[PDB]
Design an enzyme around this catalytic site. Structure first.
Site, mmCIF file in Angstrom:
data_model
loop_
_atom_site.group_PDB
_atom_site.id
_atom_site.type_symbol
_atom_site.label_atom_id
_atom_site.label_comp_id
_atom_site.label_asym_id
_atom_site.label_seq_id
_atom_site.Cartn_x
_atom_site.Cartn_y
_atom_site.Cartn_z
ATOM 1 N N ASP A 144 -2.285 -1.299 5.626
ATOM 2 C CA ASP A 144 -2.759 -0.405 7.073
ATOM 3 C C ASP A 144 -4.275 -0.149 7.487
ATOM 4 O O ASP A 144 -4.899 0.411 7.874
ATOM 5 C CB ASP A 144 -2.053 0.340 7.530
ATOM 6 C CG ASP A 144 -1.348 1.588 6.115
ATOM 7 O OD1 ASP A 144 -2.851 1.457 5.897
ATOM 8 O OD2 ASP A 144 -0.807 2.053 6.294
ATOM 9 N N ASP A 159 0.249 -0.855 -0.059
ATOM 10 C CA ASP A 159 0.056 -0.236 -0.128
ATOM 11 C C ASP A 159 0.673 1.173 0.197
ATOM 12 O O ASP A 159 1.814 1.184 0.243
ATOM 13 C CB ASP A 159 -0.892 -0.039 1.591
ATOM 14 C CG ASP A 159 -1.941 0.582 1.146
ATOM 15 O OD1 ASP A 159 -2.346 2.144 0.166
ATOM 16 O OD2 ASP A 159 -2.987 0.840 1.653
ATOM 17 N N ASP A 212 -0.342 4.700 0.929
ATOM 18 C CA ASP A 212 -0.886 5.932 2.286
ATOM 19 C C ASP A 212 -0.538 4.804 3.737
ATOM 20 O O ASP A 212 -0.987 4.251 3.089
ATOM 21 C CB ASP A 212 -2.392 6.504 1.919
ATOM 22 C CG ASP A 212 -2.202 7.658 1.187
ATOM 23 O OD1 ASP A 212 -0.784 8.405 1.155
ATOM 24 O OD2 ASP A 212 -3.218 7.965 0.700
HETATM 25 O O1 LIG Z 1 -9.021 7.115 0.917
HETATM 26 C C1 LIG Z 1 -8.112 6.803 1.726
HETATM 27 O O2 LIG Z 1 -7.553 6.759 3.477
HETATM 28 C C2 LIG Z 1 -7.019 7.678 0.842
HETATM 29 C C3 LIG Z 1 -5.684 6.064 1.452
HETATM 30 O O3 LIG Z 1 -4.833 6.094 0.151
HETATM 31 O O4 LIG Z 1 -6.784 7.809 -0.304
HETATM 32 C C4 LIG Z 1 -7.697 9.111 -0.588
HETATM 33 O O5 LIG Z 1 -7.358 9.849 -0.395
HETATM 34 C C5 LIG Z 1 -5.616 10.436 -0.740
HETATM 35 C C6 LIG Z 1 -5.803 11.672 0.119
HETATM 36 O O6 LIG Z 1 -5.577 11.350 1.445
HETATM 37 C C7 LIG Z 1 -5.826 9.874 -2.005
HETATM 38 O O7 LIG Z 1 -4.439 10.618 -2.522
HETATM 39 C C8 LIG Z 1 -6.421 8.917 -2.594
HETATM 40 O O8 LIG Z 1 -6.990 9.233 -4.319
HETATM 41 C C9 LIG Z 1 -7.984 8.604 -2.405
HETATM 42 O O9 LIG Z 1 -9.035 10.256 -2.706
HETATM 43 O O1 LIG Z 2 -2.512 4.094 -0.868
HETATM 44 P P1 LIG Z 2 -3.579 4.193 -0.036
HETATM 45 O O2 LIG Z 2 -4.485 2.791 -0.165
HETATM 46 O O3 LIG Z 2 -3.706 3.908 1.647
HETATM 47 MG MG LIG Z 3 -3.640 2.468 3.000
#
Ligand SMILES: O=C(O)[C@@H](CO)O[C@H]1O[C@H](CO)[C@@H](O)[C@H](O)[C@@H]1O
Ligand SMILES: O=[P-]([O-])[O-]
Ligand SMILES: [Mg+2]
Ligand SMILES: [Cl-]
Ligand SMILES: [Mg+2]
Lengths: 252, 252
Positions: free
Chosen positions: A202, A6, A8
């Site tokens: 996560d 992943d 984020d």
């Molecule tokens: O759902 C979330 O918590 C994050 C995890 O990556 O994704 C959204 O939120 C992110 C921004 O915090 C965006 O970069 C992604 O495109 C999406 O909109």
């Molecule tokens: O990159 P996203 O699934 O936290």
């Molecule tokens: Mg994530």
């Protein structure tokens, strides 16, 4: 071995930068272990991080391959080849209108919001927000906490699927991290290399990832999902630990 | 005699047009009775109805006069002079950002939404929604029901005022239909003509209008406020009845 990870909260810090994960990644790279991002982020976001295919975007909605991938699959999207696994965003958005009518309350997502509004909601810059809004498959929802139950039931009623990415709920159809990982593995040039898969994540959207891999590692906060490995620290420091303690000892 | 009139549900019917009220209006015109729209709508929306100044927009946020009005007031703007009674939209939006920080949760309004989203949420065409988004004083909010009270307290803490317009909450500072009415009466060229004011409205939110006029008429559904006349039929039917019953006999 392939490492599916992943972005984020896992490979990226809370500032959204690949800083702290560098050592760990270069370690894997030096040992020629492929690292494949599997993320809620859009293709434009992944590109802005400098990441190259193969990678999996929007919760498994799209699988991006290098144009010269040895196994022919997907359609040329320019410089890439793309395997579309989920409904396109326009169809999700249309179906969301039906969920909203059913729910009798607004259901807002990024597609309803300005880049400026998304930037303010996410902490992202204006430019980053534009890239987050450039969605091909999955919609990021902005829901009232108290309305979540009713909204999710309305999504199910109209044939949408939902997940949670760490901060926001998402709506899509056919976007599953595990399904995308399985497809990528089946399209891998070296069967032996794809035979053993690692997954790090996560958030709720990563449970399908943990099930599609052979070794699952959780680097979020709190207790790990059922029977999944844990690390002493969350995020990139958890990623580093897992690489050093779980992966390298396995590469010998 | 001056007739101050609400638009939606009062002068305009369910389809957003005239009908029974067209004849009523023509009759007032013929007797030389000025009719002044007083509305929650923006100036762009009022212009799209073909309405000429003077009129009062955004719940009393702005008073639009003909450029050649015999009493000099307001700031020149094309074919108008504009008396701004309320804080500008830009300052309201900035205060909303502050309120968001106090409330620890997002406060979204029209300025955060696309025209398409506003259209969907209001039942308007995209074109009409663009005109509803061209706001100069008042912001329309889209609030989570269970977060309302926390939000409203935050709004007040940062110096904003709020109202509920039937569907959504609004935030502004200095926008009051009564104050705008009193101002326009004070700016009327012929004081004798402004001595007797009539106010017609269809909502409890017209109370400030009703208080600022000498004869108040409620053409809404259910019971009228205390000290306010009612008509047997709602909307333009009531407007026509009111003009026939209450006004026409006065001019004879
Ligand atoms: O759902 C979330 O918590 C994050 C995890 O990556 O994704 C959204 O939120 C992110 C921004 O915090 C965006 O970069 C992604 O495109 C999406 O909109
Ligand atoms: O990159 P996203 O699934 O936290
Ligand atoms: Mg994530
Ligand atoms: Cl109105
Ligand atoms: Mg009205």
């Amino acid at each position: 071995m392939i490492v599916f990870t992943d972005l984020d909260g896992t490979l990226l810090d809370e500032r959204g930068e690949l800083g702290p994960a560098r050592e760990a990644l270069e370690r894997l790279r030096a040992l020629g272990v492929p690292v494949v991002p599997v993320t809620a982020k859009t293709r434009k976001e992944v590109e802005a991080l400098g990441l190259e295919p193969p990678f999996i975007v929007e919760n498994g909605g799209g699988l991006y391959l290098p144009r010269d991938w040895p196994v022919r699959a997907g359609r040329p999207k320019g410089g890439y080849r793309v395997v579309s696994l989920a409904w396109p965003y326009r169809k999700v958005r249309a179906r969301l209108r039906e969920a909203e009518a059913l729910a009798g309350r607004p259901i807002l997502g990024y597609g309803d919001l300005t880049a400026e509004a998304v930037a303010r909601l996410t902490g992202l810059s204006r430019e980053a927000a534009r890239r987050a809004k450039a969605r091909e498959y999955d919609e990021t929802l902005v829901l009232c906490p108290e309305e979540v139950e009713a909204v999710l039931e309305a999504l199910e009623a109209v044939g949408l699927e939902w997940t949670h990415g760490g901060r926001f709920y998402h709506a899509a159809k056919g976007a599953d991290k595990g399904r995308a990982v399985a497809r990528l593995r089946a399209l891998w040039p070296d069967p032996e290399e794809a035979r053993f898969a690692v997954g790090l994540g996560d958030s709720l959207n990563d449970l399908p990832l943990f099930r599609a891999v052979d070794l699952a590692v959780y680097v979020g906060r709190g207790d790990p999902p059922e029977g999944v490995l844990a690390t002493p620290a969350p995020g990139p420091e958890g990623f580093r630990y897992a690489v050093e303690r779980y992966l390298l000892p396995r590469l010998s």
